[PDB]
Ligand binder design. Structure first.
Ligand SMILES: Nc1ncnc2c1ncn2[C@@H]1O[C@H](COP(=O)(O)CP(=O)(O)OP(=O)(O)O)[C@@H](O)[C@H]1O
Ligand SMILES: Nc1nc2c(ncn2[C@@H]2O[C@H](COP(=O)(O)OP(=O)(O)O)[C@@H](O)[C@H]2O)c(=O)[nH]1
Length: 610
């Protein structure tokens, strides 16, 4: 198997002997232009940025740094003057603006963006691919200032705050001090070295005694895990990981394990195999960060450093649930059990017994400490690994290939019919339109027609609003009565942002029409709007923690304020994630584009209100 052949290594520093690290000096003109674009964006009433000034307490000259932070969604515009996440600027003693800290570019999980679809990665990246272990603590940035100060920052901050004994950046600096003393070097030596390289060192602080995350980093493992070195310039240029490991050795950092894989299809197979257990090389692994080169035009053009991530769902999602349930337990709140119901109830009974036997544990858990150990104690009590515990609840979804019914929960104009047509174009799935059924006994006849479509199709789009809970109850009950293996998947159009929903849907129906039967008989815009407001008023959100929506096999949240092209890719990506043998891969962006274009050209209802 691929996971057995490929082992993560922290022994690549020898492979870096002789190699030259990337280096670009800061251009005063370009840096000033960046700072002016940021400053201007910070003063404005799309592209927005927050500017926060911090004194550098260890600076002998009193240096200050400006930390810049975009709105998180801005990273998907093409507008930004830099895509750094983590960005601090400063001024030299002689008044030159400089980049003091340059984090990685913001990067995304598989299927989170167009660029991190496997279909796009396969076309537009080149290897060899660096698979770096994603250690989970907090990020620490380290660089050298002109006055010789070693600057240490967390993702967006630096220095001490009086509202905590030890900030994240100060904890990182204290770890740095100990690691440098361990090798006979000094903070000013490291500062001079990083400034000579015009670079930011990027490490993960992992230390249970400071703050617990998901996996334990006890005293034997606690420290700064160096995983990157970036150039302090507006574009993104990062060190090859063998040189990162060599730098870790020279300056006393812990190393981030690395695997190099040449072929993107082996990368994909390796990751999906590790995802079966969340473990590799006999340790738990929360994920990988994959580093390669990417071009904007597939196959040609210039290539730039580019990352994507692959985070493993289990057992870490169950572990996060257990942590939250534990906090609910000691505070007297209701534990919220979403998934893994049987083993989580056992975990809570176990935790209650431990708490009754040792009251002082609650004061540890109050401070978010000891909770990893409680989970490991419980797994020991069960003689189970977490991955086994997370597989106790299993609805057989991994094996599903057919008999899926997609059930919109929506109001008029959310794009249901458009989505159904697009899915038929892409996958050949069935589509039953309640709008085409007239007369009495409509809900049982609709339901039976939906069922019977499974004779010729692996899935069927059950096209009805289902705005009221009683309609989901009816459909759930009648399907389960007549078809013992059908899985019902709700496509819940979330109506939280109700006045934006109203505008978007009403624009669609008024301007481009809708075949809902009441719309097709509406003879003016006021009748249309009143009909639409009727469904809004009657609408009951999907709530999979209560009856009847609890009966759905899965719920996929969609956004009626978003275009149908975006809701289409959410549907497919989520179906793939939930039922990987049903939707085996997400089609390329171009195919979903063509599906939606076909949907709105072939499906054009008449407007009887004009
Ligand atoms: N080998 C590695 N390469 C890159 N980043 C790594 C890494 N090992 C750990 N990381 C961490 O992984 C982070 C990005 O992955 P995510 O955990 O998904 C960001 P997030 O948790 O969604 O928001 P947050 O960073 O503000 O908490 C980086 O910011 C860095 O702290
Ligand atoms: N411009 C635009 N029009 C859309 C989009 N999605 C749906 N429509 C149109 O909105 C109208 C109602 O869409 P429909 O799929 O019938 O919504 P339904 O009532 O929820 O089934 C149709 O004329 C669609 O072509 C979209 O993403 N963009």
């Amino acid at each position: 198997s691929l996971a057995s052949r490929y082992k993560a290594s922290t022994d690549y520093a020898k492979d870096a002997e002789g190699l030259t690290a990337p280096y670009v000096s800061q251009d005063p003109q370009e840096t000033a232009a960046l700072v002016r674009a940021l400053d201007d964006a910070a003063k404005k009433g799309g592209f927005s940025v927050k500017k926060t000034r911090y004194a550098v307490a260890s600076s002998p000259t009193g240096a200050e740094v400006d930390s810049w932070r975009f709105n998180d969604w801005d990273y998907k515009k093409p507008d930004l003057p830099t895509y750094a996440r983590g960005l601090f600027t400063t001024r030299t003693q002689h008044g030159v603006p400089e980049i003091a800290v340059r984090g990685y570019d913001k990067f995304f999980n598989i299927d989170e963006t167009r660029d991190t679809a496997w279909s796009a990665i396969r076309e537009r990246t080149k290897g060899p691919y660096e698979l770096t272990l994603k250690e989970n603590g907090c990020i620490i940035f380290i660089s050298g200032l002109e006055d010789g100060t070693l600057l240490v920052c967390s993702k967006h901050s630096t220095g001490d705050r009086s509202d905590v004994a030890l900030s994240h950046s100060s904890a990182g600096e204290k770890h740095l001090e100990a690691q440098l003393e361990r090798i006979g070097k000094t903070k000013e030596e490291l500062a001079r070295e990083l400034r000579k390289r015009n670079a930011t060192a990027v490490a993960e602080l992992c230390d249970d005694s400071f703050e617990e995350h998901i996996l334990a980093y006890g005293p034997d493992k606690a420290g700064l895990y160096l995983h990157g070195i970036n150039l302090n310039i507006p574009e993104f240029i990062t060190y090859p990981s063998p040189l990162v490991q060599k730098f870790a050795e020279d300056w006393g950092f812990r190393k981030t394990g690395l695997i190099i894989i040449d072929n993107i299809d082996d990368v994909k197979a390796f990751l999906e195999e590790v995802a079966e257990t969340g473990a590799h090389d006999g340790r738990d692994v929360e994920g990988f960060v994959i580093r390669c080169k990417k071009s904007t035009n597939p196959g040609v053009g210039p290539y730039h450093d580019w990352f994507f991530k692959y985070k493993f769902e289990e057992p870490y999602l169950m572990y996060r649930q257990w942590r939250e349930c534990t906090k609910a337990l000691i505070s007297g709140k209701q534990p919220k059990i979403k998934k893994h119901v049987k083993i989580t109830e056992e975990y809570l009974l176990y935790a209650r017994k431990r708490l009754a036997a040792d009251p002082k544990l609650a004061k540890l858990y109050n401070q978010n400490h000891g909770i990893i150990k409680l989970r490991n104690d419980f797994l020991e009590y069960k003689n189970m690994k977490g991955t086994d515990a997370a597989n106790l609840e299993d609805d057989g979804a991994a094996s599903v290939t057919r008999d899926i019914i997609l059930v919109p929960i929506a109001t008029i104009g959310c794009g249901k019919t458009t989505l159904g047509v697009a899915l038929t174009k892409l996958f050949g799935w069935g589509h039953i339109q309640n709008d085409n059924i007239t007369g009495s006994k409509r809900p049982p006849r609709f339901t039976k027609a939906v069922l019977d479509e499974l004779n010729e199709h692996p899935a069927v789009f059950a096209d009805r609003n289902n705005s009221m809970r009683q309609e989901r109850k009816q459909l759930l009950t009648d399907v389960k009565m007549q078809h013992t293996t059908a899985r019902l998947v709700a496509l819940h159009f979330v109506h939280d942002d109700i006045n934006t929903v109203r505008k978007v849907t009403q624009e669609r129906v008024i301007q481009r029409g809708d075949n809902h039967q009441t719309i097709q008989a509406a003879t003016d815009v006021n009748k249309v709007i009143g009909i639409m407001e009727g469904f809004i008023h009657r609408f009951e959100p999907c709530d999979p923690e209560k009856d009847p929506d609890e009966g759905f096999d899965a719920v996929i949240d969609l956004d009626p304020t978003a275009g149908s092209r975006e809701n289409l890719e959410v549907v497919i990506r989520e179906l793939h994630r939930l039922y990987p043998n049903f939707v085996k891969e997400v089609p390329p962006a171009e195919a979903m584009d063509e599906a939606i274009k076909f949907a709105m050209e072939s499906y054009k209802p008449d407007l009887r209100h004009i």
